[PDB]
Amino acid sequence: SLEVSVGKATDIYAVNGTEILLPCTFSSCFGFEDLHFRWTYNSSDAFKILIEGTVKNEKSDPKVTLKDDDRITLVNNISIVLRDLEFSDTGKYTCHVKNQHHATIFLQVV
Amino acid sequence: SLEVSVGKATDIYAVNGTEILLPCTFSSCFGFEDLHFRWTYNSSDAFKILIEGTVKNEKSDPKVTLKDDDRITLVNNISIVLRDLEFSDTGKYTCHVKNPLQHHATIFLQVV
């Protein structure tokens, strides 16, 4: 039918020592098969693949195929949660989705 | 045709004296005709209708039918921009959308 969004980019502030949800959801008018997704971290001096996986189809959950660290977990929802935040976690978190698309979260740990 | 989103709620910080975009977009699978939208402000002690309008259908631009103040403008996309921000502009900005069942997106704005 119809759904609303605050867009594809957001700044999030979060306190050191806690946990934060980094949101990304996607919608499919059509029927998708074998979706590919990847979360990356970027700072001026650093790059990391945080987590990646696939989504077989609209009915099935996302399967995680690779994960950098167990401080990260996955929660159509491909949001991630970053546990036990540190000040070095500040930077840019991007969710890339194939089958071409990306959402961007700027995380500031305070 | 696929589309991603960071969701339906966000916190926004903005500097007094400047302008801020309060985002809300919507997507149509089936389609729509004569959609109704309304933006409200809420604080613990206050309520306002900021702007109201309709979108004739998926091809047409949004049509504004009522606006509280010219500090607000509309910028499919039914985002609004709030100009000449004041500290009292802090609060909850909600975008309500109706398709005849209702949907809404919520911005928490803190002016700093």
Numbering used by the authors:
A (entry chain B): 30 to 104, 112 to 135, 142 to 152
B (entry chain A): 30 to 104, 112 to 136, 141 to 152
From the paper:
Voltage-gated sodium channels are transmembrane proteins responsible for the generation of action potentials in excitable cells and play important roles in the propagation of electrical impulses throughout nerves. They are complexes of a pore-forming α subunit and auxiliary β subunits, designated β1/β1B–β4 (encoded by SCN1B–4B). In this study, we determined the crystal structures of the mouse and human β4ex proteins containing all three Cys residues, which revealed the formation of a dimer in a parallel arrangement, mediated by the intermolecular disulfide bond and the exchange of the N-terminal segments.
In this study, the human β4ex containing all of the Cys residues was prepared, and its crystal structure was determined in the hexagonal form at 2.2-Å resolution. The human β4ex also assumes the same parallel arrangement as those in the previous and present mouse β4ex crystals. The anti-parallel arrangement was not observed in the cubic and hexagonal crystal forms, probably because PEG fragments were bound to the trans homophilic interface (hexagonal form) and because detergent was used for the crystallization and the C-terminal tag sequence was present (cubic form) (see “Experimental Procedures”). This type of interaction is designated hereafter as the N–N interaction. Moreover, in this N–N interaction, the N-terminal segments form hydrogen bonds between their Glu32 and Ser34 with Ser56 and Thr54, respectively, and join the β sheets of the counterparts. As these intermolecular interactions are sophisticated and conserved in the human and mouse β4 structures, we hereafter designate the two β4ex molecules in the parallel arrangement as the parallel dimer.
